[PDB]
Design a protein around this ligand. Sequence first.
Ligand SMILES: [Ca+2]
Ligand SMILES: [Ca+2]
Ligand code: NA
Lengths: 223, 58
Amino acid sequence: IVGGYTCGANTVPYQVSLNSGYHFCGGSLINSQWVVSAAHCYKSGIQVRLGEDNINVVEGNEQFISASKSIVHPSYNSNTLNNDIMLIKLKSAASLXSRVASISLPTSCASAGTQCLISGWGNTKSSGTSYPDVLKCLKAPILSDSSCKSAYPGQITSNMFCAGYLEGGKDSCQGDSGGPVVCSGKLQGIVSWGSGCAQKNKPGVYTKVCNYVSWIKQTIASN
Amino acid sequence: RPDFCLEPPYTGPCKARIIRYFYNAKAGLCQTFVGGGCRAKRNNFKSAEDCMRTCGGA
Ligand SMILES: [Ca+2]
Ligand SMILES: [Ca+2]
Ligand code: NA
């Protein structure tokens, strides 16, 4: 997260870290046994780390649970990045309380201008590299489909949306993928891609979760 | 033909922070870099062994 702020220990209870010997992606807990992340975050031997703040130190509220299933959307296109969503089943149910909690799926899509909370342990620099110990947060608005397409000609599908600030300086970055974009208590997006990070005229692109609600519910229930 | 082993490492547009390997012709060895998770070029390996086998001596 570039241009953000320190969330505070466990202030984003649904945020999880995907670990494969180190942190490589984020995710959002939607129930005691399931996590939503990005399809490009599909990796081998994933371990989900819940209740995390400082990703480099054991603080006492962590729950490390291995992934028992990692289901990439059947229509994920690795070239266009369309349908960039993945569902991870936890090998054992996570203990939910305040520090570890699920986030609700949307009942309807969000409109342009809606303020959302984006979080993660990704790069905090637009130029260069610096990864935080603690979870970072960022308030950013959902942008119009028209502005998103103008920023990325011939690249934005109906399953993607832009969010951020066109002047640059605030954005999600490498290490944030799979993480949440929560608006009014609903998980509306998944950190996906963008041209660099926090660059002028290049807002972050996110997977439009509201288009997958039925698929998410049915897939989870059938696994 | 252009040797893909001599192309600079490409993180890509996706925002994962996956540690991958690329052959650094200047240093003469396979080094680590951050792969974003999508649109990978060929000088992007999962291990030092894969990188050395494919690009060693380039
Ligand atoms: Ca910790
Ligand atoms: Ca290296
Ligand atoms: Na802390």
